[PDB]
């Protein structure tokens, strides 16, 4: 729980990244989020946007849950030596925070990517070909992509697409059902 596999663009055929969340610390005080790793300014901002939406999404889904409001959460992307940037992992951060807050592991062999706004809308991201190739190399079964990237995904070669269950989403509410079927 608290670990979600993501997709990243790399010159060496792309790669898949992970997002790890953990409790940093065990009445009006509020929690805080710390982001570690060589994250760029755009990537750091996306974590703040994801953190705000994750808090808001929790009130509607589970008002009694106050894990994301009071607790202090540490977010780390492993392999900190390599620099990371881009809003690609915005939706991955939301799932990691939600999984940690709800204490439920995300669906196995599931990878997601795509920029997310603080209202929950999923925005298209570049490097669809690299992300899809890295997903197959990582041996994932389900891949979540923005709905606006449907043309990019279907423009790829036939032999790098079959065998992959791809989900196209517009809002994070659809990602929540896929990530946490229950």
Give residues in contact with other proteins (CB under 8 A): 30, 41-42, 45-46, 48-49, 52-53, 55-56, 59, 69, 86-87, 115, 117-119, 121, 123
- Least distance in Å: CB of 117 to other proteins? 5
For other proteins, give the closer residue by CB, 22 or 70.
70
Query: What is the Cβ-side half-sphere exposure of residue 70, based on CA atoms within 13 angstroms?
Result: 8
- Least distance in Å: CB of 52 to other proteins? 4
- Least distance in Å: CB of 95 to other proteins? 18
For other proteins, give the closer residue by CB, 55 or 84.
55
For other proteins, give the closer residue by CB, 122 or 135.
122
For other proteins, give the closer residue by CB, 1 or 31.
31
Q: How many CB atoms lie within 10 A of CB 108?
A: 9
d(CA 80, CA 90): 18
- Least distance in Å: CB of 118 to other proteins? 5
- Least distance in Å: CB of 158 to other proteins? 30
For other proteins, give the closer residue by CB, 114 or 140.
114
User: Looking at the chain, which runs of residues are DSSP E strands?
Assistant: 3-8, 15-23, 33-36, 73-76, 110-112, 115-116, 122-123, 142-146, 165-169
Cβ neighbours of residue 150 under 8 Å, at least 6 residues apart?
A: 168
Going by C-alpha positions, the residue among 71, 83, 142, 132 that lies closest to residue 111 is 142
CA distances in angstroms from 175 to 40, 51, 86, 130, listed in the order given: 25, 16, 20, 21
3-state secondary structure of 50: helix
């Amino acid at each position: 729980p608290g670990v979600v596999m993501g997709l990243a663009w790399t010159a060496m055929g792309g790669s898949t990244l992970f997002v790890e969340t953990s409790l940093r610390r065990p009445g009006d005080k509020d929690g805080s989020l710390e982001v570690t790793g060589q994250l760029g300014e755009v990537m750091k901002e996306s974590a703040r946007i994801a953190y705000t939406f994750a808090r808001a999404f929790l009130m509607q889904h589970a008002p009694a849950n106050d894990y994301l409001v009071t607790s202090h959460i540490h977010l780390h992307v492993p392999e900190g030596a390599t620099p990371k940037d881009g809003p690609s992992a915005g939706c991955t951060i939301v799932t990691a925070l939600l999984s940690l807050a709800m204490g439920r592991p995300v669906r196995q062999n599931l990878a997601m990517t795509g920029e997310v706004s603080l209202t929950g809308k999923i925005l298209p991201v570049g490097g669809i070909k690299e992300a899809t190739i890295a997903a197959k190399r990582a041996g994932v079964t389900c891949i979540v992509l923005p709905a606006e990237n449907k043309k990019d995904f279907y423009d790829l070669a036939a032999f790098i697409t079959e065998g992959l269950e791809v989900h196209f989403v517009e809002h994070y509410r659809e990602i929540f059902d896929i990530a946490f079927p229950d």
